[PDB]
Amino acid sequence: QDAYVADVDGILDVLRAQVLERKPDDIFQFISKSALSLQVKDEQKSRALTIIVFGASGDLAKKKTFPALFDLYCGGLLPPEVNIIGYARTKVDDVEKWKHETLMKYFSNLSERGCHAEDFLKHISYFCGAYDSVDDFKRLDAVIREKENAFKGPEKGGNRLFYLALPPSVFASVCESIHKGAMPQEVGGWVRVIIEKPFGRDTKSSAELSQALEPFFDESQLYRIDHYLGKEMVQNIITTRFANRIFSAVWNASNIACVQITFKETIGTEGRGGYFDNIGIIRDVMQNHLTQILALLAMEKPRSLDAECIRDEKVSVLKCIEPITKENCVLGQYTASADGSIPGYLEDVTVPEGSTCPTFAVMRLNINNDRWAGVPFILKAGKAVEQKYVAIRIQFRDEVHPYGEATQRNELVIRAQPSEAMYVKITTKVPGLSGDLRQTHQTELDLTYHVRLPDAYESLINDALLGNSTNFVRKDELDVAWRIFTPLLHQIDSGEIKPIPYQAGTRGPKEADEFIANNGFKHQK
Amino acid sequence: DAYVADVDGILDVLRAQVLERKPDDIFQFISKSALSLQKDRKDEQKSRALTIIVFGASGDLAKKKTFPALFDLYCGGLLPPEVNIIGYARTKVDDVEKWKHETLMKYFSNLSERGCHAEDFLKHISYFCGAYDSVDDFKRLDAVIREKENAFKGPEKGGNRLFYLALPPSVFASVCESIHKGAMPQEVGGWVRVIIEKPFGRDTKSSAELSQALEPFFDESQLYRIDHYLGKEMVQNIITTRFANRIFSAVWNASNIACVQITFKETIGTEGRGGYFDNIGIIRDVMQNHLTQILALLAMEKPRSLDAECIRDEKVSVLKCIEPITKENCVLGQYTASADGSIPGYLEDVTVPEGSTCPTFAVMRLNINNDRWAGVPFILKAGKAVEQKYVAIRIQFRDEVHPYGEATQRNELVIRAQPSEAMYVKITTKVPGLSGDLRQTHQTELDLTYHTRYDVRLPDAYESLINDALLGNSTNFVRKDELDVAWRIFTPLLHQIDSGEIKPIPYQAGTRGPKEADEFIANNGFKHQK
């Protein structure tokens, strides 16, 4: 009765999303040929499922979390009768208008998925309330409990995933509202809460935040997101090394010379620089993303492939890492480039005067155990640099004999961005006319055995839906991870080291490239 | 017409690529090689004059085996422009140049993709009629050689002389004395090298005798015992992949390797030449000489250079650690008629005696006993009239039982050198199809060598040693002491076979061989993917 108006405005705006995602020569025919085009998985369905997204119209939820859920709906990884609930403080007039202009503008690839698009919005309902009012959680508890019992399944109760797409200052009170008014029925079901970075800003900050949530949810239920890490690149580190004797036997200090984990991004902080100015490149991606990546490379053998034995080795090996020292660190801060297409970092009005905040840093970490003593581990992240390339690179020790200068170090690389790739660099015979044994030429050998593809974030959200806690930092490791970085962070705030300038689009400060070369890395030539 | 005469030009390259290389998962091969072609975009042998004398010039080997080989090297530019080749045999030749076109040129490869390059080559060939023992006839040869050495416009003195003995071994001792007394290179300069052909004795004492008969005339720097089945391409796979790369160098020992199998297969029978084989046996045919040389290259310790005689130093080095093969560690076979009937039995041959215990098939276990190899079983297998035609290396590394259990099996490196060359490492990887579990794995194959040039029909295996001998490369040729240590490994077994203590088990052609043999491989550390 309400809105035949909103029903078409939804139809027209999906078609407008496609005309600007596939630029049409003949717009008139695109709007029309794609007009009528919009015409054990045993255990998904055992019980009903509800996804509650808080901060539902915040920038994080609308632009990254709800569109993520859309991709799983099209991929068929969500149960058929899932319901999603958007939770936000501000009221909305008619919700279906809100779905078409707050949620659906940010759904990507709508020319392959557009027919599913307006079906997807039928699974989301809106709920307006406060993140601290126990009564509104009793009204939320009522609204979800009335579709849990409307469930067509064999087995009763319901499973509840609460996504806190909120700033961290709100976390402790939303987790109290769940405990006192929104826990799943004892008739059956689990509760899992996904919490978002920043998980503190140093050792004491993050122990306090984790102690605020301790009485409300244990580690079996809390899922700390690191949405820059994907399932694709974690089974590369675990399966290639631990199922294969070729790599398992060579994965130590007796054969490895240098390990570098590199995170590059071509874009700086466009207009959110003031928000970054309090973070720093270390806190943004290094302490969380690159360190969990590093945890998987250096871990001893987990005595199972169960989630908590993998996480068990992540704490054991991070506990052997000596905290970064100020001499072992180089920082940069990006300025305007000679191209002129990017303004400087300080050319942003959002950032205060004269701040020494780094947009680029490279550091050395020394793992102290039998397996890794002596091997330098190099972490590098930088904003507004030459290219967008996140990759792992391991350099094995050179076989100087007998080939001398006819061979160089074997190299294993794992790349996650822009495109996934895994390959090893080795020296092989050249099919010379006469040939020669001294005439070799380095080659690249692939290790990947190549329909909708889920990104890193979707298969992290799906990992939480399936009960897989492997790729989420857990309480003890988050603390020991912080204890690694904060002595450096404290000394940087004290100004004991200062950032070195570099213009954007360059590789970064050239003292950083010097630091890499002086710490066991050898370049092809 | 419109650029896809070019596009069909490089699925042409992939078509030849996939059927030279058993993928069995052809699908990602053609892709992983479609994208590897994305990134694919000697003065001194005029120093001296060169003369090649091939004995037995109209013997069956020389006309069919060696003369066509030299022709292919002529087109490859691997022979000097002023090269002199002379055929030496006694048989009557009234007209010589007619004899070259129509006893020699009928066996020249390709014949018309070359163009008239065939008749250019034959113009470097001369005939010489004489006896393999007449010291006077060699002084007449020395004169005719000095009359082709003197036609050289080089600055350089002298001439280089390569004598190819396309003869049975009983003639060897007399032509090497005849060369010594009347046909050695000029004193002004040049080397002499002798290539002697396949059967070097038939046991320790037979072959020791033949080498002391040649000892007084030529040292190991001058004698080149040829084995046409090795080839440079596969020894550069064995040597370079392991010794230039720490990934493989560190796992190339007993602590990571479980089983290595060297296999020689042929679909062909004795071709009716059976009586001829009957005194040789498959062990002497390919196992003691060819596959043992292959095994030597896999198991050798690090040579402290890549010079030929430091490589050979490590080859006799490791063969000295092999306990002699024992008969309990051996099973033999003999091929019979096929179920199709397309291959007749070995004994269905008129050339072979009744009641012969000659093996057409053998698989054995060898124990290399030193720090690097103690415990690792080495399995040699040779067979005629079997499933398929392939010589290949199979090395199986020990399984990582934990943590992947039955989601993984043993890692495998294989080297297969043929017309069907291939090198690949087979290991377990994640499957990208997200049902997002780790136990959810699949073994796949990873190639290291691709066929990218294809400009060519470049040197085959046999053509690569002749060229190696011209270049002074002793690497793929067995040495006096090394030939001895190889015989001492096999001859206790060979005597017991001739004494009949073990006999060959019957098998039909086209099958894998005797069924007791495959069980023997299974009982000696070998595991099937399943």
Numbering used by the authors:
A (entry chain B): 10 to 48, 63 to 473, 478 to 552
B (entry chain A): 11 to 51, 64 to 552
Which sentences from the paper describe this structure?
The housekeeping enzyme glucose 6-phosphate dehydrogenase (G6PD) (EC 1.1.1.49) is the first and rate-limiting enzyme of the PPP. It catalyzes the oxidation of glucose 6-phosphate (G6P) originating from glycolysis to 6-phospho-D-glucono-1,5-lactone (6PL), whereby the cofactor NADP+ is reduced to NADPH. In the present study, we describe the crystal structures of Leishmania donovani G6PD (LdG6PD), both native and complexed with one or both substrates.
The crystals of the apoenzyme obeyed P121 symmetry with four monomers in the asymmetric unit (AU) and diffracted to 2.8 Å. The apo form crystallizes in space group P121 with two dimers (AB and CD) in the AU. Residues E30A-K32A are bound to the β-strand S442A-A444A (β13). Furthermore, the R31A side chain interacts with E467A and D469A (β14).
